[PDB]
Amino acid sequence: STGSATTTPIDSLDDAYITPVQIGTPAQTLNLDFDTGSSDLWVFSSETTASEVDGQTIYTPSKSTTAKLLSGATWSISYGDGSSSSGDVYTDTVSVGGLTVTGQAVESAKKVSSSFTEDSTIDGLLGLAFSTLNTVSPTQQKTFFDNAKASLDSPVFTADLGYHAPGTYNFGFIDTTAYTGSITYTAVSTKQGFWEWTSTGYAVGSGTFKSTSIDGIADTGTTLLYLPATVVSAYWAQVSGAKSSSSVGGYVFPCSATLPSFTFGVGSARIVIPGDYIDFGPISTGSSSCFGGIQSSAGIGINIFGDVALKAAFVVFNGATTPTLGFASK
């Protein structure tokens, strides 16, 4: 079997992407953030404190004839950004784009931090990292991908993210019309539970390619691209008036400048991020300082190939027994 769903940017900056997901019987449809950087499926619920809910669609297990409380199970999770949520756990039927999993763990938020309350557009997260990172205790639960793997025609999903436009998540097949040239696959390390791979180098604009190993993770749940200080400093040095700012928490640049492209290596291939994809617009309304889409990993501990990089490619997440990552240009 297969499934196919459209994902849509939540705002004008592509800050995150939401994908409709059917939970329960009869279906309750929530707009979930597909996150290959985590491994929990959590949703706002009829159990979330009414003060931490501002305009989201909530999951109501009492209205679902297939919902069952997973007695005694709890979860608690925190993200790199400082986000957090936690609560109890239900099992229910979950469908993505026609692909149905029965008995999927659905983690109901009794509490959410305010980064989540702040945005009305995201009803929850669908984690697509490896199940070893799932936070349910005492019995760790599997991700939607792991549960569906058995029934999928091929144990793959693909991320085809749009620049200021909708895109696609496909499960169980590779759409050969969605990309150009050939797909380059590269080895994944699952040791930390992430889709962790090694980039073979980078270039800035039309400069020469620098061959150097950059370990990092493919994370649809992270907006920006986070790379080592040396690489990042070499990129921003080519933008007149760019500087790392104190008050803002990263590199900013005059909104009047034109940004060079950025190339990263996948084995012997190259993926080019156009300079426009790196512009995240004014730090505040009317400001002439603009926020950059490439920022330093130093204060994170991990390099993150986030949406800014992923949207420049057709990405294959291959969850075969030896997992790999494929990149093609599009």
Side-chain angles (χ1 to χ4, degrees), residues 1-62 64-67 69-110 112-117 119-190 192-242 244-330:
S1 61
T2 65
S4 189
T6 298
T7 192
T8 305
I10 60 152
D11 60 26
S12 57
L13 302 182
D14 296 346
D15 280 312
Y17 295 84
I18 54 174
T19 309
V21 174
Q22 280 67 50
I23 308 176
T25 317
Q28 304 170 44
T29 296
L30 273 70
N31 297 339
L32 297 193
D33 184 358
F34 282 29
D35 179 7
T36 64
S38 64
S39 297
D40 288 49
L41 204 175
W42 76 259
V43 302
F44 286 82
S45 167
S46 47
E47 290 172 335
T48 319
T49 78
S51 90
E52 292 164 349
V53 174
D54 184 16
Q56 292 97 353
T57 298
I58 58 156
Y59 167 59
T60 308
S62 60
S64 174
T65 74
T66 44
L69 181 78
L70 198 67
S71 177
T74 56
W75 63 290
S76 188
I77 187 165
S78 315
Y79 301 86
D81 63 351
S83 268
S84 269
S85 40
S86 78
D88 47 14
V89 181
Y90 294 83
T91 63
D92 211 333
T93 299
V94 171
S95 300
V96 176
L99 166 69
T100 303
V101 165
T102 61
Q104 168 65 42
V106 179
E107 297 165 43
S108 159
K110 322 226 272 195
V112 292
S113 77
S114 274
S115 305
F116 294 122
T117 304
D119 204 15
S120 303
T121 64
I122 296 180
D123 308 317
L125 262 66
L126 192 138
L128 298 165
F130 294 96
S131 282
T132 52
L133 293 175
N134 181 258
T135 74
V136 175
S137 94
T139 310
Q140 206 166 35
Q141 298 302 304
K142 304 172 133 15
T143 76
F144 176 86
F145 183 46
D146 282 339
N147 278 327
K149 259 189 202 172
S151 72
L152 284 179
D153 290 358
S154 211
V156 306
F157 67 93
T158 66
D160 182 7
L161 299 181
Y163 174 59
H164 300 338
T168 306
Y169 281 112
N170 287 334
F171 290 85
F173 72 98
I174 291 172
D175 179 354
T176 58
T177 76
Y179 61 87
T180 53
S182 57
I183 303 174
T184 303
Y185 293 87
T186 189
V188 166
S189 164
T190 60
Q192 300 177 262
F194 299 114
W195 290 92
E196 184 171 6
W197 65 292
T198 305
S199 171
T200 48
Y202 74 97
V204 178
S206 59
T208 36
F209 187 90
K210 165 79 153 311
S211 283
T212 181
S213 288
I214 309 168
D215 292 4
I217 65 165
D219 185 1
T220 56
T222 291
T223 313
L224 303 181
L225 176 59
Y226 293 91
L227 296 166
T230 54
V231 170
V232 170
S233 174
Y235 175 85
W236 286 110
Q238 296 306 312
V239 178
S240 288
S244 194
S245 152
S246 45
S247 323
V248 179
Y251 278 93
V252 297
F253 66 97
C255 295
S256 58
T258 39
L259 297 178
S261 67
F262 184 82
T263 295
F264 65 94
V266 189
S268 50
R270 309 302 169 232
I271 297 295
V272 181
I273 311 171
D276 312 83
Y277 291 26
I278 300 159
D279 188 337
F280 274 74
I283 66 174
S284 321
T285 306
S287 172
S288 74
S289 289
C290 272
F291 191 71
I294 293 178
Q295 303 289 349
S296 171
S297 75
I300 282 172
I302 195 50
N303 303 311
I304 305 170
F305 293 82
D307 293 338
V308 162
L310 300 183
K311 71 174 76 157
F314 180 85
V315 194
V316 178
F317 295 78
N318 176 346
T321 166
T322 302
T324 59
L325 265 170
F327 291 85
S329 56
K330 61 185 192 184

PDB file of all heavy atoms in Angstrom, residues 290-329:
ATOM      1  N   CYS A 290      17.456  42.190   7.906  1.00  0.00           N
ATOM      2  CA  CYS A 290      16.856  40.924   7.528  1.00  0.00           C
ATOM      3  C   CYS A 290      17.601  39.738   8.163  1.00  0.00           C
ATOM      4  O   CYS A 290      18.809  39.808   8.424  1.00  0.00           O
ATOM      5  CB  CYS A 290      16.879  40.810   6.010  1.00  0.00           C
ATOM      6  SG  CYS A 290      15.454  41.533   5.206  1.00  0.00           S
ATOM      7  N   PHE A 291      16.858  38.664   8.442  1.00  0.00           N
ATOM      8  CA  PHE A 291      17.363  37.528   9.219  1.00  0.00           C
ATOM      9  C   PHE A 291      17.804  36.407   8.278  1.00  0.00           C
ATOM     10  O   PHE A 291      17.134  36.110   7.285  1.00  0.00           O
ATOM     11  CB  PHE A 291      16.326  37.013  10.234  1.00  0.00           C
ATOM     12  CG  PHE A 291      16.898  36.012  11.234  1.00  0.00           C
ATOM     13  CD1 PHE A 291      17.774  36.409  12.239  1.00  0.00           C
ATOM     14  CD2 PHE A 291      16.588  34.670  11.145  1.00  0.00           C
ATOM     15  CE1 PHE A 291      18.314  35.489  13.128  1.00  0.00           C
ATOM     16  CE2 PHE A 291      17.124  33.745  12.043  1.00  0.00           C
ATOM     17  CZ  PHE A 291      17.980  34.159  13.034  1.00  0.00           C
ATOM     18  N   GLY A 292      18.983  35.850   8.524  1.00  0.00           N
ATOM     19  CA  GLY A 292      19.529  34.855   7.617  1.00  0.00           C
ATOM     20  C   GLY A 292      19.087  33.434   7.905  1.00  0.00           C
ATOM     21  O   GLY A 292      18.846  33.030   9.057  1.00  0.00           O
ATOM     22  N   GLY A 293      19.019  32.649   6.828  1.00  0.00           N
ATOM     23  CA  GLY A 293      18.526  31.299   6.908  1.00  0.00           C
ATOM     24  C   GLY A 293      19.604  30.260   7.152  1.00  0.00           C
ATOM     25  O   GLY A 293      19.303  29.061   7.230  1.00  0.00           O
ATOM     26  N   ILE A 294      20.857  30.712   7.245  1.00  0.00           N
ATOM     27  CA  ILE A 294      22.023  29.898   7.580  1.00  0.00           C
ATOM     28  C   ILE A 294      22.608  30.481   8.857  1.00  0.00           C
ATOM     29  O   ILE A 294      22.988  31.659   8.880  1.00  0.00           O
ATOM     30  CB  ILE A 294      23.086  29.896   6.467  1.00  0.00           C
ATOM     31  CG1 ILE A 294      22.579  29.197   5.212  1.00  0.00           C
ATOM     32  CG2 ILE A 294      24.424  29.093   6.915  1.00  0.00           C
ATOM     33  CD1 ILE A 294      23.522  29.188   4.062  1.00  0.00           C
ATOM     34  N   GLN A 295      22.686  29.661   9.908  1.00  0.00           N
ATOM     35  CA  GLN A 295      23.105  30.068  11.235  1.00  0.00           C
ATOM     36  C   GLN A 295      24.041  29.000  11.798  1.00  0.00           C
ATOM     37  O   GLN A 295      24.097  27.861  11.314  1.00  0.00           O
ATOM     38  CB  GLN A 295      21.874  30.276  12.120  1.00  0.00           C
ATOM     39  CG  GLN A 295      20.878  31.286  11.587  1.00  0.00           C
ATOM     40  CD  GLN A 295      21.450  32.732  11.704  1.00  0.00           C
ATOM     41  OE1 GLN A 295      22.502  32.956  12.365  1.00  0.00           O
ATOM     42  NE2 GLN A 295      20.782  33.697  11.031  1.00  0.00           N
ATOM     43  N   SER A 296      24.766  29.406  12.827  1.00  0.00           N
ATOM     44  CA  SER A 296      25.821  28.595  13.412  1.00  0.00           C
ATOM     45  C   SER A 296      25.233  27.455  14.239  1.00  0.00           C
ATOM     46  O   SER A 296      24.293  27.648  15.006  1.00  0.00           O
ATOM     47  CB  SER A 296      26.743  29.429  14.306  1.00  0.00           C
ATOM     48  OG  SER A 296      27.637  28.552  15.013  1.00  0.00           O
ATOM     49  N   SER A 297      25.793  26.260  14.079  1.00  0.00           N
ATOM     50  CA  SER A 297      25.480  25.124  14.965  1.00  0.00           C
ATOM     51  C   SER A 297      26.116  25.204  16.362  1.00  0.00           C
ATOM     52  O   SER A 297      25.716  24.434  17.254  1.00  0.00           O
ATOM     53  CB  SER A 297      25.867  23.808  14.272  1.00  0.00           C
ATOM     54  OG  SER A 297      27.252  23.623  14.279  1.00  0.00           O
ATOM     55  N   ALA A 298      27.093  26.093  16.574  1.00  0.00           N
ATOM     56  CA  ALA A 298      27.986  25.976  17.732  1.00  0.00           C
ATOM     57  C   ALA A 298      27.230  25.798  19.047  1.00  0.00           C
ATOM     58  O   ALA A 298      27.613  24.968  19.884  1.00  0.00           O
ATOM     59  CB  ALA A 298      28.887  27.205  17.835  1.00  0.00           C
ATOM     60  N   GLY A 299      26.207  26.617  19.282  1.00  0.00           N
ATOM     61  CA  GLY A 299      25.378  26.508  20.467  1.00  0.00           C
ATOM     62  C   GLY A 299      24.224  25.531  20.349  1.00  0.00           C
ATOM     63  O   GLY A 299      23.124  25.838  20.804  1.00  0.00           O
ATOM     64  N   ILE A 300      24.454  24.345  19.784  1.00  0.00           N
ATOM     65  CA  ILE A 300      23.406  23.335  19.610  1.00  0.00           C
ATOM     66  C   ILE A 300      24.022  21.950  19.804  1.00  0.00           C
ATOM     67  O   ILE A 300      23.372  21.016  20.284  1.00  0.00           O
ATOM     68  CB  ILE A 300      22.760  23.437  18.215  1.00  0.00           C
ATOM     69  CG1 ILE A 300      21.772  24.586  18.141  1.00  0.00           C
ATOM     70  CG2 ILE A 300      22.062  22.150  17.863  1.00  0.00           C
ATOM     71  CD1 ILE A 300      21.257  24.830  16.728  1.00  0.00           C
ATOM     72  N   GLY A 301      25.254  21.773  19.374  1.00  0.00           N
ATOM     73  CA  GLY A 301      25.895  20.484  19.497  1.00  0.00           C
ATOM     74  C   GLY A 301      25.715  19.561  18.316  1.00  0.00           C
ATOM     75  O   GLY A 301      26.369  18.522  18.261  1.00  0.00           O
ATOM     76  N   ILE A 302      24.888  19.926  17.344  1.00  0.00           N
ATOM     77  CA  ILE A 302      24.606  19.081  16.195  1.00  0.00           C
ATOM     78  C   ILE A 302      24.366  20.013  15.011  1.00  0.00           C
ATOM     79  O   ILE A 302      23.800  21.098  15.162  1.00  0.00           O
ATOM     80  CB  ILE A 302      23.424  18.127  16.527  1.00  0.00           C
ATOM     81  CG1 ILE A 302      23.303  16.988  15.526  1.00  0.00           C
ATOM     82  CG2 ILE A 302      22.089  18.816  16.557  1.00  0.00           C
ATOM     83  CD1 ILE A 302      24.585  16.231  15.252  1.00  0.00           C
ATOM     84  N   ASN A 303      24.856  19.619  13.841  1.00  0.00           N
ATOM     85  CA  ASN A 303      24.492  20.312  12.619  1.00  0.00           C
ATOM     86  C   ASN A 303      23.138  19.828  12.122  1.00  0.00           C
ATOM     87  O   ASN A 303      22.840  18.633  12.154  1.00  0.00           O
ATOM     88  CB  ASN A 303      25.587  20.105  11.572  1.00  0.00           C
ATOM     89  CG  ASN A 303      27.001  20.601  12.097  1.00  0.00           C
ATOM     90  OD1 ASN A 303      27.113  21.702  12.605  1.00  0.00           O
ATOM     91  ND2 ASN A 303      28.016  19.762  12.005  1.00  0.00           N
ATOM     92  N   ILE A 304      22.322  20.757  11.646  1.00  0.00           N
ATOM     93  CA  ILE A 304      20.956  20.429  11.259  1.00  0.00           C
ATOM     94  C   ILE A 304      20.705  20.947   9.851  1.00  0.00           C
ATOM     95  O   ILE A 304      20.721  22.162   9.620  1.00  0.00           O
ATOM     96  CB  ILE A 304      19.921  21.009  12.233  1.00  0.00           C
ATOM     97  CG1 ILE A 304      20.214  20.554  13.661  1.00  0.00           C
ATOM     98  CG2 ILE A 304      18.458  20.618  11.804  1.00  0.00           C
ATOM     99  CD1 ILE A 304      19.409  21.257  14.711  1.00  0.00           C
ATOM    100  N   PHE A 305      20.501  20.020   8.912  1.00  0.00           N
ATOM    101  CA  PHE A 305      19.960  20.281   7.584  1.00  0.00           C
ATOM    102  C   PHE A 305      18.442  20.382   7.692  1.00  0.00           C
ATOM    103  O   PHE A 305      17.704  19.393   7.599  1.00  0.00           O
ATOM    104  CB  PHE A 305      20.401  19.193   6.616  1.00  0.00           C
ATOM    105  CG  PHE A 305      21.878  19.209   6.360  1.00  0.00           C
ATOM    106  CD1 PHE A 305      22.732  18.601   7.243  1.00  0.00           C
ATOM    107  CD2 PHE A 305      22.420  19.889   5.271  1.00  0.00           C
ATOM    108  CE1 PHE A 305      24.101  18.634   7.005  1.00  0.00           C
ATOM    109  CE2 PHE A 305      23.763  19.929   5.057  1.00  0.00           C
ATOM    110  CZ  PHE A 305      24.597  19.310   5.908  1.00  0.00           C
ATOM    111  N   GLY A 306      17.979  21.606   7.911  1.00  0.00           N
ATOM    112  CA  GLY A 306      16.576  21.883   8.103  1.00  0.00           C
ATOM    113  C   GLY A 306      15.849  22.220   6.815  1.00  0.00           C
ATOM    114  O   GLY A 306      16.325  21.952   5.708  1.00  0.00           O
ATOM    115  N   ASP A 307      14.666  22.802   6.968  1.00  0.00           N
ATOM    116  CA  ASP A 307      13.805  23.022   5.798  1.00  0.00           C
ATOM    117  C   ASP A 307      14.478  23.854   4.704  1.00  0.00           C
ATOM    118  O   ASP A 307      14.279  23.579   3.516  1.00  0.00           O
ATOM    119  CB  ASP A 307      12.495  23.684   6.198  1.00  0.00           C
ATOM    120  CG  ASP A 307      11.603  22.777   7.051  1.00  0.00           C
ATOM    121  OD1 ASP A 307      11.733  21.525   7.040  1.00  0.00           O
ATOM    122  OD2 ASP A 307      10.824  23.374   7.822  1.00  0.00           O
ATOM    123  N   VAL A 308      15.282  24.865   5.076  1.00  0.00           N
ATOM    124  CA  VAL A 308      15.993  25.680   4.085  1.00  0.00           C
ATOM    125  C   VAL A 308      16.806  24.813   3.127  1.00  0.00           C
ATOM    126  O   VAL A 308      16.917  25.119   1.939  1.00  0.00           O
ATOM    127  CB  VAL A 308      16.899  26.697   4.799  1.00  0.00           C
ATOM    128  CG1 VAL A 308      17.915  27.212   3.843  1.00  0.00           C
ATOM    129  CG2 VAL A 308      16.100  27.807   5.401  1.00  0.00           C
ATOM    130  N   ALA A 309      17.435  23.753   3.628  1.00  0.00           N
ATOM    131  CA  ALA A 309      18.195  22.886   2.735  1.00  0.00           C
ATOM    132  C   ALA A 309      17.329  21.822   2.098  1.00  0.00           C
ATOM    133  O   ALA A 309      17.463  21.543   0.909  1.00  0.00           O
ATOM    134  CB  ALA A 309      19.328  22.188   3.484  1.00  0.00           C
ATOM    135  N   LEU A 310      16.461  21.206   2.875  1.00  0.00           N
ATOM    136  CA  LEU A 310      15.660  20.112   2.359  1.00  0.00           C
ATOM    137  C   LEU A 310      14.747  20.564   1.225  1.00  0.00           C
ATOM    138  O   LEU A 310      14.571  19.824   0.258  1.00  0.00           O
ATOM    139  CB  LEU A 310      14.839  19.489   3.491  1.00  0.00           C
ATOM    140  CG  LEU A 310      15.695  18.917   4.625  1.00  0.00           C
ATOM    141  CD1 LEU A 310      14.938  18.251   5.699  1.00  0.00           C
ATOM    142  CD2 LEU A 310      16.725  17.928   4.075  1.00  0.00           C
ATOM    143  N   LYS A 311      14.157  21.772   1.322  1.00  0.00           N
ATOM    144  CA  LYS A 311      13.230  22.217   0.279  1.00  0.00           C
ATOM    145  C   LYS A 311      13.911  22.398  -1.068  1.00  0.00           C
ATOM    146  O   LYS A 311      13.219  22.434  -2.087  1.00  0.00           O
ATOM    147  CB  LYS A 311      12.507  23.522   0.653  1.00  0.00           C
ATOM    148  CG  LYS A 311      13.355  24.769   0.661  1.00  0.00           C
ATOM    149  CD  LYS A 311      12.511  26.020   0.895  1.00  0.00           C
ATOM    150  CE  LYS A 311      12.093  26.169   2.349  1.00  0.00           C
ATOM    151  NZ  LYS A 311      11.754  27.589   2.721  1.00  0.00           N
ATOM    152  N   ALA A 312      15.243  22.516  -1.109  1.00  0.00           N
ATOM    153  CA  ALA A 312      15.967  22.614  -2.378  1.00  0.00           C
ATOM    154  C   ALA A 312      16.111  21.250  -3.055  1.00  0.00           C
ATOM    155  O   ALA A 312      16.628  21.156  -4.174  1.00  0.00           O
ATOM    156  CB  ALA A 312      17.345  23.254  -2.135  1.00  0.00           C
ATOM    157  N   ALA A 313      15.656  20.176  -2.419  1.00  0.00           N
ATOM    158  CA  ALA A 313      15.852  18.860  -3.006  1.00  0.00           C
ATOM    159  C   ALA A 313      14.606  17.976  -2.899  1.00  0.00           C
ATOM    160  O   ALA A 313      13.681  18.225  -2.120  1.00  0.00           O
ATOM    161  CB  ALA A 313      17.076  18.162  -2.354  1.00  0.00           C
ATOM    162  N   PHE A 314      14.630  16.909  -3.689  1.00  0.00           N
ATOM    163  CA  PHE A 314      13.754  15.766  -3.486  1.00  0.00           C
ATOM    164  C   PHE A 314      14.495  14.803  -2.549  1.00  0.00           C
ATOM    165  O   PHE A 314      15.597  14.340  -2.859  1.00  0.00           O
ATOM    166  CB  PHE A 314      13.379  15.152  -4.844  1.00  0.00           C
ATOM    167  CG  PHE A 314      12.484  13.955  -4.749  1.00  0.00           C
ATOM    168  CD1 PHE A 314      11.119  14.090  -4.654  1.00  0.00           C
ATOM    169  CD2 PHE A 314      13.008  12.685  -4.758  1.00  0.00           C
ATOM    170  CE1 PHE A 314      10.272  12.943  -4.508  1.00  0.00           C
ATOM    171  CE2 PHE A 314      12.175  11.589  -4.672  1.00  0.00           C
ATOM    172  CZ  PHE A 314      10.779  11.742  -4.562  1.00  0.00           C
ATOM    173  N   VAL A 315      13.909  14.517  -1.394  1.00  0.00           N
ATOM    174  CA  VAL A 315      14.592  13.753  -0.361  1.00  0.00           C
ATOM    175  C   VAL A 315      13.910  12.399  -0.137  1.00  0.00           C
ATOM    176  O   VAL A 315      12.741  12.345   0.265  1.00  0.00           O
ATOM    177  CB  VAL A 315      14.648  14.560   0.938  1.00  0.00           C
ATOM    178  CG1 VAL A 315      15.603  13.977   1.863  1.00  0.00           C
ATOM    179  CG2 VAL A 315      15.065  16.003   0.623  1.00  0.00           C
ATOM    180  N   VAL A 316      14.693  11.324  -0.234  1.00  0.00           N
ATOM    181  CA  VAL A 316      14.212   9.973   0.032  1.00  0.00           C
ATOM    182  C   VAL A 316      14.708   9.487   1.397  1.00  0.00           C
ATOM    183  O   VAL A 316      15.917   9.410   1.644  1.00  0.00           O
ATOM    184  CB  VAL A 316      14.656   9.009  -1.078  1.00  0.00           C
ATOM    185  CG1 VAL A 316      14.183   7.565  -0.753  1.00  0.00           C
ATOM    186  CG2 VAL A 316      14.211   9.504  -2.449  1.00  0.00           C
ATOM    187  N   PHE A 317      13.785   9.184   2.300  1.00  0.00           N
ATOM    188  CA  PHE A 317      14.109   8.603   3.602  1.00  0.00           C
ATOM    189  C   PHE A 317      13.861   7.100   3.446  1.00  0.00           C
ATOM    190  O   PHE A 317      12.712   6.655   3.405  1.00  0.00           O
ATOM    191  CB  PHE A 317      13.270   9.193   4.745  1.00  0.00           C
ATOM    192  CG  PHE A 317      13.518  10.668   5.004  1.00  0.00           C
ATOM    193  CD1 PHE A 317      12.967  11.625   4.180  1.00  0.00           C
ATOM    194  CD2 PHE A 317      14.304  11.079   6.068  1.00  0.00           C
ATOM    195  CE1 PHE A 317      13.209  12.979   4.402  1.00  0.00           C
ATOM    196  CE2 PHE A 317      14.560  12.389   6.280  1.00  0.00           C
ATOM    197  CZ  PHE A 317      13.987  13.356   5.455  1.00  0.00           C
ATOM    198  N   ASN A 318      14.942   6.319   3.359  1.00  0.00           N
ATOM    199  CA  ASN A 318      14.841   4.899   3.040  1.00  0.00           C
ATOM    200  C   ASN A 318      15.045   4.082   4.314  1.00  0.00           C
ATOM    201  O   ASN A 318      16.155   3.985   4.833  1.00  0.00           O
ATOM    202  CB  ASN A 318      15.845   4.508   1.953  1.00  0.00           C
ATOM    203  CG  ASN A 318      15.830   2.994   1.656  1.00  0.00           C
ATOM    204  OD1 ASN A 318      15.263   2.173   2.412  1.00  0.00           O
ATOM    205  ND2 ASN A 318      16.442   2.630   0.550  1.00  0.00           N
ATOM    206  N   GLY A 319      13.976   3.476   4.800  1.00  0.00           N
ATOM    207  CA  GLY A 319      13.998   2.858   6.108  1.00  0.00           C
ATOM    208  C   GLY A 319      14.145   1.366   5.915  1.00  0.00           C
ATOM    209  O   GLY A 319      13.589   0.601   6.706  1.00  0.00           O
ATOM    210  N   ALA A 320      14.832   0.934   4.843  1.00  0.00           N
ATOM    211  CA  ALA A 320      15.318  -0.445   4.769  1.00  0.00           C
ATOM    212  C   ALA A 320      16.186  -0.809   5.991  1.00  0.00           C
ATOM    213  O   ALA A 320      16.581   0.027   6.831  1.00  0.00           O
ATOM    214  CB  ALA A 320      16.139  -0.707   3.488  1.00  0.00           C
ATOM    215  N   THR A 321      16.502  -2.102   6.053  1.00  0.00           N
ATOM    216  CA  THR A 321      17.222  -2.624   7.200  1.00  0.00           C
ATOM    217  C   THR A 321      18.564  -1.935   7.337  1.00  0.00           C
ATOM    218  O   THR A 321      19.024  -1.699   8.456  1.00  0.00           O
ATOM    219  CB  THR A 321      17.385  -4.140   7.091  1.00  0.00           C
ATOM    220  OG1 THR A 321      18.356  -4.588   8.043  1.00  0.00           O
ATOM    221  CG2 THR A 321      17.825  -4.542   5.692  1.00  0.00           C
ATOM    222  N   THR A 322      19.198  -1.582   6.201  1.00  0.00           N
ATOM    223  CA  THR A 322      20.328  -0.660   6.176  1.00  0.00           C
ATOM    224  C   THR A 322      19.786   0.687   5.711  1.00  0.00           C
ATOM    225  O   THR A 322      19.625   0.891   4.506  1.00  0.00           O
ATOM    226  CB  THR A 322      21.439  -1.144   5.240  1.00  0.00           C
ATOM    227  OG1 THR A 322      21.879  -2.440   5.661  1.00  0.00           O
ATOM    228  CG2 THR A 322      22.635  -0.163   5.241  1.00  0.00           C
ATOM    229  N   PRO A 323      19.464   1.608   6.609  1.00  0.00           N
ATOM    230  CA  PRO A 323      18.793   2.848   6.172  1.00  0.00           C
ATOM    231  C   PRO A 323      19.743   3.742   5.389  1.00  0.00           C
ATOM    232  O   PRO A 323      20.958   3.746   5.617  1.00  0.00           O
ATOM    233  CB  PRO A 323      18.333   3.512   7.478  1.00  0.00           C
ATOM    234  CG  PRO A 323      19.196   2.915   8.558  1.00  0.00           C
ATOM    235  CD  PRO A 323      19.637   1.508   8.067  1.00  0.00           C
ATOM    236  N   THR A 324      19.188   4.458   4.409  1.00  0.00           N
ATOM    237  CA  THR A 324      19.944   5.466   3.678  1.00  0.00           C
ATOM    238  C   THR A 324      19.079   6.698   3.426  1.00  0.00           C
ATOM    239  O   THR A 324      17.855   6.664   3.568  1.00  0.00           O
ATOM    240  CB  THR A 324      20.451   4.935   2.325  1.00  0.00           C
ATOM    241  OG1 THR A 324      19.327   4.517   1.531  1.00  0.00           O
ATOM    242  CG2 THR A 324      21.482   3.754   2.513  1.00  0.00           C
ATOM    243  N   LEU A 325      19.753   7.761   2.971  1.00  0.00           N
ATOM    244  CA  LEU A 325      19.148   9.036   2.589  1.00  0.00           C
ATOM    245  C   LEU A 325      19.501   9.293   1.133  1.00  0.00           C
ATOM    246  O   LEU A 325      20.669   9.175   0.747  1.00  0.00           O
ATOM    247  CB  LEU A 325      19.673  10.207   3.437  1.00  0.00           C
ATOM    248  CG  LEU A 325      18.838  10.609   4.648  1.00  0.00           C
ATOM    249  CD1 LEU A 325      19.575  11.594   5.508  1.00  0.00           C
ATOM    250  CD2 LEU A 325      17.516  11.186   4.201  1.00  0.00           C
ATOM    251  N   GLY A 326      18.499   9.655   0.342  1.00  0.00           N
ATOM    252  CA  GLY A 326      18.686   9.992  -1.064  1.00  0.00           C
ATOM    253  C   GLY A 326      18.352  11.448  -1.312  1.00  0.00           C
ATOM    254  O   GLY A 326      17.410  11.984  -0.738  1.00  0.00           O
ATOM    255  N   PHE A 327      19.135  12.091  -2.149  1.00  0.00           N
ATOM    256  CA  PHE A 327      18.906  13.470  -2.536  1.00  0.00           C
ATOM    257  C   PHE A 327      18.950  13.529  -4.046  1.00  0.00           C
ATOM    258  O   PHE A 327      19.858  12.960  -4.659  1.00  0.00           O
ATOM    259  CB  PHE A 327      19.973  14.454  -1.995  1.00  0.00           C
ATOM    260  CG  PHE A 327      19.933  14.652  -0.525  1.00  0.00           C
ATOM    261  CD1 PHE A 327      20.595  13.787   0.318  1.00  0.00           C
ATOM    262  CD2 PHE A 327      19.264  15.713   0.025  1.00  0.00           C
ATOM    263  CE1 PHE A 327      20.548  13.942   1.679  1.00  0.00           C
ATOM    264  CE2 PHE A 327      19.281  15.891   1.399  1.00  0.00           C
ATOM    265  CZ  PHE A 327      19.916  14.996   2.205  1.00  0.00           C
ATOM    266  N   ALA A 328      17.988  14.247  -4.626  1.00  0.00           N
ATOM    267  CA  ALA A 328      17.996  14.609  -6.037  1.00  0.00           C
ATOM    268  C   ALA A 328      17.682  16.094  -6.178  1.00  0.00           C
ATOM    269  O   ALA A 328      17.016  16.689  -5.327  1.00  0.00           O
ATOM    270  CB  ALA A 328      16.970  13.761  -6.861  1.00  0.00           C
ATOM    271  N   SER A 329      18.162  16.687  -7.262  1.00  0.00           N
ATOM    272  CA  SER A 329      17.754  18.043  -7.580  1.00  0.00           C
ATOM    273  C   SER A 329      16.362  18.027  -8.218  1.00  0.00           C
ATOM    274  O   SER A 329      15.883  17.008  -8.727  1.00  0.00           O
ATOM    275  CB  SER A 329      18.787  18.716  -8.491  1.00  0.00           C
ATOM    276  OG  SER A 329      18.971  17.936  -9.640  1.00  0.00           O
TER     277      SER A 329
END
